[PDB]
Design a protein around this ligand. Structure first.
Ligand SMILES: CC(C)Oc1cncc(N2CC[C@]3(CCCN3C)C2)c1
Ligand SMILES: CC(C)Oc1cncc(N2CC[C@]3(CCCN3C)C2)c1
Ligand SMILES: [Mg+2]
Ligand SMILES: [Mg+2]
Lengths: 211, 205, 203, 204, 211
């Protein structure tokens, strides 16, 4: 219990030492790794061509300014902190139709090597024609995710896998998933020498009664 | 009276003028539910809406005091924004949870905190069967979003959901409501991830 | 200009209370004025009310001598500037919506009056609203966290004020009462007073 | 560059506990009605969009322009100043603010504030589908001040319909904003309001 | 180490630039007026409600202006020529839809790009409900609606509102929207309002569309 007291003291000192980053630049680029876990397709609205998804969006990056030596802080190897306490990337859906609704606490995990893990659960409405959702072939919709203001020369956007994690998809959803991918795409624009990356979520789905 | 007030302002000042738990400073959080109403069961989207009181209790050595040194004050009320609170989250919500009560906690001199938010939650639930004798069954998990069992050790006092305040004229009657202390582990690793699973069997009244 | 300085002074003095305790308990008087039953939803058994909730209490720490401040006997101030009681509907189904400014009137004897207008959705079965006898619903109001030993809840009348009820509402009011009750809840050892709004209404 | 420093200097020098019987204020109010959006006969609520012009004058906001680079006015966040607690007395939802919360202060101490708002209020739309139309009314005034602290004025008793949406679902037959001063038998204080009265019908 | 040092130095230089600009603007005036250039990119007509004559649009609103107080010499800051910053860190113009029927909803991060010549570019994505009769949307001719954008409180003598083109950018319009765009323009106008003595400029978005 005294050991509990010391651990708490060492964490307070670590946080003070770390917290008491202006974002990436061409000279100091940052890798941001993204992955999606799709939990539910809640609603597919054919009157407005909007579909509503619930997913967990895993984001990971590493900063030198968040590094420490566990030995100088009682072997603390990671801690939790408010996502407001730190810089976070401006990763955005490019075709949402409503402000995204955040479903989880905005808290990140920081590890002694300076890596940050942040996994917000989100409900998103996005542009999607659900024609065919009541057929055996199903509907197909897609939404791109990427930085709002940074090129690939500033935020190098990566994934760990092309596959959307479906292991938590709600088994009694109104919609069954036929496939879900998160392929990465690059676009070269006329205006800029820089490349712009996105991760596109592509979901093929149908009414559970359509099969 | 003026004295008891200055003792309390002094206590608060002394206490308030916690970085959360860690593997070496783990915290036990006890959870229990009072189910007040099933408001809405939407078969077009498979979402159900519940209203419940979520009782949370934990203890911090940093919130301990001697009542004798503070005018025999044994507890006080404080804004939940004034203290650390655990990040207990429904794991299958479909809308942000709506808070229905004041965000005020009770702190007792042994360092124990009691916090009981009333909430409305929309969560994933197929109500097929609700219009039958057998009813429908749904489940939702509650737990920390970011802490494993090494940091927040989640407990229950009972597995019996409190139904004594359940709305007697709800559109839905409760056949049973149980709160289970569950966990999952990856065999590769020591970390365990606990949750309280709220399981509710219900039908059209 | 002198009056302005006197008021600025008085407010500085007063603002530059940790809430009630068992050793320093507080009386809060509640009264309701019902303006409108807006909506009765039989699909979810929720009814929507618009009402004003009059709250009154008195603190020694808010007292002053008017002669020491230019004969100022009361002032208006943001309800955020002072402590306010945590009076809550116990069976709301949506967060309560405030429809008026949150401004309290403080009087030199330390008494405070605060009267927010609110729209509330709450648990209510409207069966019978399309009949002569109507529907009856009830909602309790009280402190969320303070027991009877910390906040004593009083009323000035057992009848809800209907003198401002909207005369072209979809619903007419047959009766509306606001009796006091005391209840032990399973979570806790202490007894909690409330004011129960009971309303009978029909289309 | 100099004009910026003077403006920053003005604001610093300037930056009020509200009016009193000894220090009273007059608020001039007027409405510009843009749209009747929805008339809901299942709940007897009607939804309006309007601009609410508010004007008042504080001695504590006066300055000599010659002491500040000939500056005669400035824009500021409505949160940087005291604003009157003018409220609809029969709303059924919180008002939604549709414009930036910015006021203009002028060197005579006058403030102008014109929030665009969507308001749901209590209104039975029976008759809207007829030649005569429906009529509804909502009173505006201070929530906590009497006429001895805040008096109300209007520049006109006719609602400005010059911005009313021509292809609204509802056409306006008339719209007035008469000011009333009520003395209740109980009390010395006078209670002013401005009542928005609108007669309207489904556009044909 | 050199590479890591070089990253440290570019971070320091950016942090220092932001401190010099921010930690050491009150808006335009008749004596110090500001040009604001606007342009719209229309992404989707989501919904047309004939029961209330409200239509819902998703668009990106490009705003550009230039401040002397935001200038710097890149040679004085490690050759930094532009940077990204929260739009809360700088003054932004009070550009408003004049006939919205609900508060505008912001769909993107609110981050501006500031360039060493003092120019600012800010491009929020928004969902807007505005006054619009969709009668005729179910016909070959379609419906036509308009909405004005401009400053709420600054007259033409304070903010001079310009465009780069009379044409709304449709190159990102959602190909499977419920509604097809027939034309979309953004002409400038100058208007006298009853409340006020001054002339106020607007940019009017006029959109012709059909099912
Ligand atoms: C033990 C007590 C001092 O602390 C509390 C903290 N939060 C809520 C409560 N309560 C008590 C009972 C209840 C149920 C309805 C409102 N209320 C008084 C919630 C109590
Ligand atoms: C008189 C001016 C200096 O102060 C103001 C304050 N608020 C709004 C406004 N206006 C001016 C006209 C109007 C109507 C539409 C938006 N706009 C420019 C509202 C003006
Ligand atoms: Mg020790
Ligand atoms: Mg170096």
């Amino acid at each position: 219990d005294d050991d509990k007291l010391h651990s708490q003291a060492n964490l307070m000192r670590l946080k003070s030492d770390l917290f008491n980053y202006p974002g990436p630049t061409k000279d100091d680029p940052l890798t941001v790794t993204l992955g999606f876990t799709l939990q539910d397709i809640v609603k597919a609205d054919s009157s407005t061509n909007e579909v509503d998804l619930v997913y967990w969006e895993q984001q990971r990056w590493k900063l030198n300014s968040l590094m420490w030596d566990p030995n100088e802080y009682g072997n603390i190897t990671d801690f939790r902190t408010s996502a407001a306490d730190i810089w976070t990337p401006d990763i955005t859906a490019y075709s949402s139709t409503r402000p995204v609704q955040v479903l989880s606490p905005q808290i990140a995990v920081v590890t002694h090597d300076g890596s940050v893990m942040f996994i917000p659960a989100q409900r998103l409405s996005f542009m999607c024609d659900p024609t065919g959702v009541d057929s055996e072939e199903g509907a197909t919709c897609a939404v791109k995710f990427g930085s709002w203001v940074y090129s690939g020369f500033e935020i190098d956007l990566k994934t760990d896998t092309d596959q959307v994690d479906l292991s938590s998809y709600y088994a009694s959803s109104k919609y069954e998933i036929l496939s879900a991918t998160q392929y990465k795409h690059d676009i070269k624009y006329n205006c800029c020498e820089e490349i712009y990356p996105d991760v596109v979520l592509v979901v093929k789905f149908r009414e559970r009664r359509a099969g």
